[PDB]
Design a protein around this nucleic acid. Structure first.
Lengths: 143, 60, 137, 190, 103, 158, 73
RNA sequence: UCCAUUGCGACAACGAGCGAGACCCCGGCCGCGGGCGCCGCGGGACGGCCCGCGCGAGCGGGAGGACGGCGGGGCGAUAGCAGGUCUGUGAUGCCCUCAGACGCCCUGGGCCGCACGCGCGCUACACUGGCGGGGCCAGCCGGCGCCCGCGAGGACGCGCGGAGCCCCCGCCGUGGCCGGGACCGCGGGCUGGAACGCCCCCGCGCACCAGGAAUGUCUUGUAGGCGCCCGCCCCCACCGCG
């Protein structure tokens, strides 16, 4: 920091994971714009990358952009714990992974597919649009 | 045109329904010693000074 | 003495001294923790460990001969939980960090155990007073 | 005297007064402590608040909003900031400005419901000094409060601008506009 | 011979507990016993609905039980096993004021 | 954590006993649930709260509120003697006022010519009366009608 | 609605951001934000640079608010 | 005249009583005693003093005093309601159930089901703010050490113990944005015979920009804001008494 004038390579709008990001917000908060990332995950991701966290996102050079990317598709091997992941024990792999924008839709949409054929109580209520938890519905949530 | 000010000599108690307004007997310390009457809203006590935008008006 | 100076100056000065003297070292787990269930995100500063250590040793000095346990230190670093469409409530901090700090200090003999908990040792008092007078001016 | 109570340990209360006579005595300017925080049980009698230091009266209204209830320290800090700003724009003592403003606000006439007054029959009446000072204070504080909601700038700057404008009598300020509106509408009913 | 003894007293009324005390202390001046240590009052509290059913305005009862405690343990060496009974008999036994003894 | 009525406080068993006998004087101040105990003696102008000097207290804003009696009374007297207050009870501001009351009474208890004491009492009470006389009002209990002492649960007629 | 940047381009850190305030007598982060239509952080940085130069002096400091005076005149 | 059938002064009325006040608990100031732990007995304030008025009862002001004129609670007259309660009871009259039982015991399920109308509440709409670090004080009252685990929790072993707001340093900088955290998807644990119950972590991130006709409560430690203990309870408080 102490950066007044814009870097010659300062990029005003950034595109990643098919998502576009601004170049005036701080880095750790900008990355929150993606699906599968938050504040807690991000810092633990940048920091492993020897990246600074209080730098405006547009001034992120190209070399950092990749290493940041590398530690994001390869989290575990880079050290980060298994309790900081959005997917801990996959149903098929049995693994611990962290999935992103292209995947959230499929892993979720595929989950309900498994519940309809399995006929669980939960799956049916996902169909008529009720509440899966045990919330009372007599007098609340009236469309 | 130039509002003057008058001093309170006494008080004649609440009159208006729901309280509030109070009749008063004032005089002009402008030097004419004109003892008259007026109505006032808000707590007021003896020696208080009022600002009268009227050199002349009467109530009762 | 030590209480004739505000804590803010003493804490930071001592933490800098400590980091310079290698007396204690940040372990690995100091870089993904949130410091307490109450807290919402992780700390911004990269050297909070040393600040916490300085504060803890100052707390051990204040109590003098009296004893302190770890869980009693966690209740001096509590906060307020929020974000639950429910009235707020108070929660205790985490004790793994505190345990690490006290264990490291004890390994340096600045901190002698007793029947319950631990209490300052005269060497620790010596050092704390020395730095207190060093910063006195 | 033996001690001068430099407010916030900067500005004195010596060469300070009020021009207007109607409310000259309903404004305490000499019994100010170094800090406007007195545990005085004011509002106990009917006319004891006329002795409350004016600044404490002012701060006790800056925390009128429900969220900010019971917060006097922030109010004192705010007031100090505003006083420095006033000194920096004007070069004179902010207390003078504050008293002049409280005098230049406050209606001198208002409409009420006298006798039966059926069918919205509202006569005109004059006003007592105490209500004048109260309304002046309330208007200053509310005007600064209305400007700083969902706006970038802080509460202190709005406060100081309002205060200086009112001391100038400019219609631009909120309090002066309110006073003029009330006075006029009451004249209509006179 | 010497045993270091304690006397406990419990009660719900303040008058008898203040009357037992005077008698016992007057009786023990010789044996070396000394005054009491008036202990913190134990406050039992119960709030109950004033009605057997939910009806009308919601009105509450507020019952309580105070228990008073005076503790003389100043006999000790001044009183031997047998001599303790000397002190627990001349006093005016009251129908409700349990007094327990324990070295 | 400290009640204000504990025997350890009104006696100040914190101090070592040999020195304890020097602090001839004792004093008390209070406000609400807050107590102040001043053991006073001869000195060269020093003061302490809970092992803390008077300047380095937490009300950076009300430091002058604490110091008032010194300035209104002058300096030579307080320079004459020394203190070590201890306080225990609810809140910060309550403790501030308790402390200043205790200081005023203790310093005013030191003089020996009651005429001087009266003159000083008159000088002081003129500035404020609560530096010498305790504040009586105290928290009021609540009732089962609602969730406050005087406010009631909102009533719906329909 | 209103967009403000947080990072000058070269010459705007001189033509106005500095040349235009030096004339002023008393200034503040939010004032200079509303004036130059730039977010506050940049104002903090620039004011730090200026006190480094020595043209302005602090009169009242605090996390909520700190203000300056123009000694240079 | 009085908050008060509270009092003065008269009257074919005289003389009494209940209710009201008096009374009991709590707190504020002082004294004595005693003491593991602040807890036992008493004093003190009474429209007493000054000034005005008024036959008077009593009204207005000013003093000194811890407190100044019903400080907060409890008790609560005669008469009555087709008010509620037979689902609190070895409280109960008259009917109906009474050996394929409305008796008693076991296994599952429900009382929580949802296009919809409203009553008491909770959270928010942000700069008088959110986040991170640090310092620091309550009372009804009250249990802690060591080691693992991010945390929630767990294994051992002993009798010992208090928070939020707030203040200070910094980041954000008017963007439905780091405001707000509903909804939903993996996972780790506790309770219990048994999760449908409750906690923790990562991720997703609904409305909501101060709310129309209408309407509620409130005069000093009061409103409002902030949190903390008990009740029921195998786990669970946005509830209630404090």
């Amino acid at each position: 920091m102490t950066t007044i004038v814009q870097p010659n390579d300062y990029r005003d709008l950034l595109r990643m994971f098919n998502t576009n990001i601004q170049g005036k917000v701080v880095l750790e908060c900008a990355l929150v714009g993606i699906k599968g990332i938050g504040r807690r995950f991000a810092n633990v991701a940048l920091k492993k990358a020897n990246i600074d966290v209080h730098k405006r996102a547009g001034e992120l050079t190209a070399a950092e952009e990749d290493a940041l990317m590398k530690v994001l598709e390869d989290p575990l091997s880079h050290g980060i714990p298994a309790w900081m992941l959005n997917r801990n024990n996959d149903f098929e792999s049995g693994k611990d992974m962290h999935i992103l924008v292209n995947t959230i839709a499929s892993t979720h949409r595929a989950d309900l597919e498994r519940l309809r054929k399995t006929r669980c109580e939960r799956g049916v209520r996902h169909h008529h649009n009720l509440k899966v938890r045990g919330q009372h519905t007599k007098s609340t949530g009236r469309r | 045109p130039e509002p003057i000010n008058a001093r309170v000599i006494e008080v004649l108690g609440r009159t208006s329904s729901r309280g509030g307004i109070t009749q008063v007997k004032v005089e002009f310390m402008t030097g004419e010693k004109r003892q008259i009457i007026r109505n006032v809203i808000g707590p007021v006590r003896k020696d208080d000074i009022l600002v009268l935008m009227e050199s002349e008006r009467e109530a009762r | 003495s030590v209480t004739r100076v505000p804590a803010d100056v003493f804490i930071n000065s001592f933490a800098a001294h400590l980091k310079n003297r290698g007396i204690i070292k940040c372990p690995a787990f100091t870089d993904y923790v949130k410091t307490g269930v109450s807290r919402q995100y992780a700390p911004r500063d990269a050297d909070w460990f040393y600040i916490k250590a300085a504060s803890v040793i100052r707390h051990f000095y204040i109590s003098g001969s009296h004893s302190i346990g770890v869980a009693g230190l966690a209740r001096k670093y509590s906060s307020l939980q929020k974000g639950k469409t429910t009235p707020h409530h108070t929660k205790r901090a985490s004790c793994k960090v505190i345990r690490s700090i006290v264990s490291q200090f004890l390994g340096q003999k600045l901190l002698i155990a007793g029947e319950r908990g631990r209490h300052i040792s005269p060497n620790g008092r010596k050092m704390v007073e020395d730095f207190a007078e060093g910063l006195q001016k | 005297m033996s001690l001068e109570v430099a407010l916030f340990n900067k500005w004195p209360l010596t060469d300070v007064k009020c021009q207007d006579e109607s409310l000259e005595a309903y404004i305490s300017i000499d019994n100010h402590s170094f800090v406007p925080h007195s545990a005085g049980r004011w509002s106990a009698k009917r006319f004891r608040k006329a002795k409350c230091p004016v600044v404490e009266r002012l701060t006790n209204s800056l925390m009128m909003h429900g969220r900010n209830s019971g917060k006097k320290l922030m109010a004192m800090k705010t007031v100090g900031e505003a006083f420095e700003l006033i000194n920096l724009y004007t070069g004179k003592n902010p207390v003078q400005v504050l008293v002049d403003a409280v005098a230049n606000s406050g209606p001198r006439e208002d409409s009420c419901r006298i006798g039966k007054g059926g069918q919205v029959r509202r006569q005109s009446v004059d006003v007592s000094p105490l209500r004048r000072v109260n309304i002046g204070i309330y208007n200053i504080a509310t005007g600064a409060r209305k400007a700083a909601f969902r706006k970038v700038r802080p509460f202190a700057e709005c406060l100081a601008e309002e205060i200086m404008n009112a001391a100038a009598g400019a219609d631009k300020s909120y309090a002066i506009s309110q006073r003029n509106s009330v006075e006029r509408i009451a004249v209509s009913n006179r | 011979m010497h045993q270091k003894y304690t006397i406990i007293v419990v009660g719900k009324d303040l008058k008898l507990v203040e009357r037992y005390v005077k008698s016992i202390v007057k009786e023990g001046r010789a044996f070396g016993i000394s005054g009491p240590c008036r202990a913190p009052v134990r406050r039992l509290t119960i709030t109950t609905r004033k009605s057997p059913c939910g009806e009308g305005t919601n009105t509450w009862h507020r019952f309580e039980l105070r228990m008073y405690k005076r503790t003389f343990w100043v006999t000790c060496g001044g009183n031997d096993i047998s001599t303790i009974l000397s002190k627990t008999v001349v006093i005016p036994g009251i129908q409700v004021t349990v007094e327990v003894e324990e070295p | 954590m400290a009640k204000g009525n504990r025997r350890d406080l009104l006696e100040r068993n914190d101090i070592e006993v040999r020195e304890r006998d020097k602090y001839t004087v004792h004093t008390l101040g209070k406000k609400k649930n807050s107590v102040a105990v001043a053991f006073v003696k001869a000195g060269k102008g020093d003061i302490l709260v809970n092992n803390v000097p008077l300047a380095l207290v937490r009300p950076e804003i009300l430091r002058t509120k604490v110091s008032e009696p010194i300035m209104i009374l002058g300096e030579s007297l307080f320079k004459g003697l020394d203190m070590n207050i201890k306080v225990a009870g609810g809140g910060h501001v309550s403790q501030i006022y308790a402390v200043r009351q205790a200081i005023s009474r203790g310093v005013l208890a030191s003089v020996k010519d009651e005429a001087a004491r009266s003159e000083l009492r008159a000088k002081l009470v003129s500035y404020d009366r609560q530096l010498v006389v305790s504040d009586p009002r105290r928290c009021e209990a609540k009732k089962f009608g609602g969730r406050g002492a005087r406010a009631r649960r909102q009533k719906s007629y329909r | 609605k209103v967009d403000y940047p947080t990072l000058f381009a070269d010459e705007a850190a001189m033509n106005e951001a500095l040349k235009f305030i030096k004339n002023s007598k008393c200034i503040t982060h939010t004032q200079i934000c509303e004036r130059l239509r730039v977010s506050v952080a940049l104002a903090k940085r620039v004011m730090r640079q200026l006190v480094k130069s020595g043209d302005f002096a602090i009169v009242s400091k605090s996390s909520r608010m700190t203000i300056f005076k123009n000694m240079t005149k």
